[model samples]
Target: SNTQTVLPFTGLNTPSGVAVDSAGTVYVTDKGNNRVVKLAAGSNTQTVLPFTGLNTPSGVAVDSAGTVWVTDHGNNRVVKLAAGSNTQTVLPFTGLNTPSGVAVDSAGTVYVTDKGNNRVVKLAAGSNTQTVLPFTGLNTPSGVAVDSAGTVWVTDHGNNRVVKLAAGSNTQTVLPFTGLNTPSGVAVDSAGTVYVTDKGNNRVVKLAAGSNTQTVLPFTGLNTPSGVAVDSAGTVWVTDHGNNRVVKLAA
Candidate 1:
């Protein structure tokens, strides 16, 4: 069954990021609306979070405990929404320059892409100290994801490429996906399948673990698609940026 659900007018405006929790709930950062919205598992109604004063939220990640992390891009800060909390608290880290993407691993460690700073930072759970990663010459790093093994994946937007730093390695390997234009958000499933939003190409590509081959997803009518995530069940969710809708596809 080629069942693809294109969710339009779910109150999403210029959506930039999308995430799915373990319970199958979907979360989206409605950038233009300055808020985050969620759809419960198997539900159709989209409800807004109690977040206020959000200025262009770009990326969103949900932890195992249901805490939501968001990159308040316009505010140059990252914030967290505790499970069932109405208000969002700004992350304690400072010196952030246009933070764009955020991801949380099983250990609750948060990885963020400081786009304007051209670097990534790691925030250990329950700690305010931000350890800057060792990636050098990152050109407008945007989206980020961490695999189960702690390998960090980032979209080097300005460089038109994606890179991964395996656990315990400082050397970053640039993915050999030629002609990746302005790639944005990225997500890795438990099986290590990597999904990236090729914004410039207006499509999403999947790179299976231990393989250099890239397969463009069978999505049509995409316009500048930006954010992407894979659920535990292998369903792919995308933020159709130019289309102003969120799409759910059974990958």
Candidate 2:
């Protein structure tokens, strides 16, 4: 007998952000439980992280080097669990108000969506200070991601749009997709295709590279999908917040 090729990760509570590493390990932030959890690729067994006192951990990203970055939302901080260390270290950029989304690029630079501040900030590879991305008129920017070409993408929740900043450009352009309601999590695959969780609509949308059309993936019974991630091989993973489970959409 053959097993299911794609499995929905269960046993989670209000799960939010999700990330898949190069080796196919999936990571999720359990918001209601105030913890982070992981699954070995397609396995159903969830392993909780050893961290304590995490308050509403939300967005998560796994870098090429395997460092796990999470937005400790209620705590207003971004924390990192290094590749080999069990210890968690909080990134020290100060005065963050309800930071929600996090993404780390190939150069180890960190980007976070300061939800309360309505801005996105970046922490360079070896920098101690964060520089705000040049985005104006943003409202409740929730989810963030960085593509392989160094372009940064963010889901503006209140504005209900997705925006991207090219690697060398300081200007932010709103992606052409319309009718997004409270879009939350955003991710980009290796091929530059973008995926976003249309939270209020209970769906996920995708935009292929060099295209202006947004296509909804075939997902049923998704409620308030919070975070989305794409593995190196282009498998899309999503945290079904209302269902309290993470789902893997096969490539």
Scored by TM-score, the top model is: 1
TM-score of candidate 1 relative to the true fold: 0.97
Off by over 4 Å in 2: 1-10
Task: Summarize candidate 2's per-residue lDDT along 23-95 as a digit string, tens digits.
Answer: 8888999999898988886576778887767999989988878889999999899999887787899897788
| lDDT tens digits, residue span 39-141, model 1 | 8876778888888789999999998899999999999999898997887888887799999999999999999999999999998988978999988689999
- For all predictions, the C-alpha RMSD in Å is 1.2, 2.4
Q: What's model 1's lDDT at 160?
A: 90
Q: What TM-score do all the candidates reach, one by one?
A: 0.97, 0.95
